[PDB]
């Protein structure tokens, strides 16, 4: 097995890809990233006991939230356009833009390269403008992916 090791946020590289083509969507200037797979847990008790008897996973998702400080035209125009099309204005249709996401992080002392990938991430809300006096525009995304497609050491 591989020892646990520290990870330094500023070493990470995040990428967004179009799930139709695996072409990159230009995105940069990340500050914070949380990627958290989750399941709702049903935690089941009997008649005969005060203790738990069984516990079961059900609704799975991956919570993705990102804070970033370089605006991308492409990321926003793809989110407006929806799957497989790019737009300069809100679209009156029900399909959200699905993004694939990968985050790559060398560990702090070079023990491993933790690569995480997530499929079909979608964002209910896109901050277009996030202006504050005397500050750079800082944008926060909250969204949900369908599953974690990869979690592995990608070092040699």
């Amino acid at each position: 097995a591989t020892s646990p090791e520290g990870i330094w946020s500023n070493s990470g590289a995040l990428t967004f890809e179009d799930p139709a083509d695996d072409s990159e969507i230009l995105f940069a200037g990340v500050r914070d990233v949380t990627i958290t797979p989750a399941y709702e847990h049903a935690e089941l008790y009997t008649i005969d006991s005060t203790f738990r008897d069984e516990v079961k996973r059900y609704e799975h998702n991956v919570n993705v939230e990102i804070t970033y400080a370089k605006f991308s035209l492409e990321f926003a125009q793809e989110w407006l356009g929806g799957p497989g099309a790019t737009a300069t204005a809100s679209q009156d249709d029900s399909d959200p833009m699905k993004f694939n996401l990968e985050n790559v992080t060398p560990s702090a002392s070079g023990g491993f390269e933790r690569t995480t990938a997530v499929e079909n991430v979608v964002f209910p809300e896109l901050p277009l403008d996030s202006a504050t006096y005397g500050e750079y525009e800082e944008y926060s995304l909250t969204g949900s992916g369908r599953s974690v497609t990869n979690l592995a050491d990608t070092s040699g």
């Binding site: 089941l44 009997t46 008897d53 079961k56 009156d92 029900s94």
Partner: protein, 284 residues
């Protein structure tokens, strides 16, 4: 953990387990059959006690495989002269009791397959207590639930036309019962007599789902063939296509309003809060 229910040699063990602090077993008692002096001539009524009372067990649980759920449904729905036998694992009840699917109920068993929840079936059961020697019946007739491996989309098939039920948000509630059996009061003994009648059983499938694309084509192909033509002596064939391990079954809508389309403010697609079918004859 598990109560045991059996119908002759065949037996099923049911986990009485639930989330949080929910009701898991309820034993209900009553005396419907005491006679009250409605006139009396005085403030407080004179009364007389003469007949078998009513004990009813409601069981709630969760099942971890579909096969055990189908075998329970077949065991519940079956007509047999052999008593339905229950064991309750909590010491306030004796180790064996004789029962029947609840006396007047259309839904003595509910099996729920909600959205998400793979390998969780939610279950509710209702059973009436009966005297162990006071079970009677007109022959034996084994219920069957068909099975298959296909793992494909569910198809509502009618007049040789087919509509696939969209998997999106799809939730199943199936209900089973023996509402045409007769439970009868007996004088000067605690528990009633029970007659396994040569009469039709209840087996209803309820869907809820949302139709996401090809919406006009989907909704008209469904509704015209199922709700705006005559099926004759035939019915819909509801091809479960190996979902839950269930095989194809023949069925028809029953009741005043079995099916609903719902169109909502700000939604680009249609909700189907109900599509209800009662199973029919396919047993020649």
């Amino acid at each position: 953990v598990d109560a045991t229910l059996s119908r002759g040699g065949t037996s099923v063990d049911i986990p009485l387990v639930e989330e949080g602090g929910e009701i898991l077993l309820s034993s209900t008692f009553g005396k419907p059959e005491v006679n009250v002096r409605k006139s009396g001539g005085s403030l407080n009524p004179r009364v007389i006690d003469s007949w078998s009372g009513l004990q009813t067990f409601q069981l709630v649980g969760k099942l971890y495989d579909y096969s055990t759920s189908h075998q329970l449904a077949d065991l519940v729905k079956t007509a047999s002269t052999t008593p339905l036998e229950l064991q309750i694992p909590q010491d306030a009840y004796p180790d064996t009791v004789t029962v029947a699917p609840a006396a007047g109920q259309a839904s003595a068993l509910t099996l729920e397959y909600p959205a998400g929840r793979k390998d969780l079936v939610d279950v509710s059961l209702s059973l009436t207590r009966v005297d162990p020697n006071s079970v009677r019946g007109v022959g034996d007739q084994q219920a069957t639930t068909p099975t298959t491996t296909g793992t494909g989309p569910v198809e509502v098939t009618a007049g040789g036309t087919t509509v696939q039920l969209p998997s999106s948000g799809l939730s199943v509630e199936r209900t089973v019962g023996r509402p045409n059996d007769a439970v009868r009061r007996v004088p000067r003994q605690a528990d009633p007599r029970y007659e396994v009648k040569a009469k039709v059983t209840n087996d209803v499938f309820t869907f809820s789902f949302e139709t996401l694309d090809n919406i006009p084509a989907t909704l008209n192909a469904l509704t015209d063939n199922v709700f705006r033509e005559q099926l004759g002596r035939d019915g819909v064939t509801l091809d479960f296509n190996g979902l839950l391990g269930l095989g194809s079954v023949k069925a028809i809508p029953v009741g005043s309003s079995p099916f609903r389309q719902v169109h909502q403010a700000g939604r680009g697609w249609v909700t189907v809060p109900t599509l209800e079918f009662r199973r029919i004859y396919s047993n020649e």
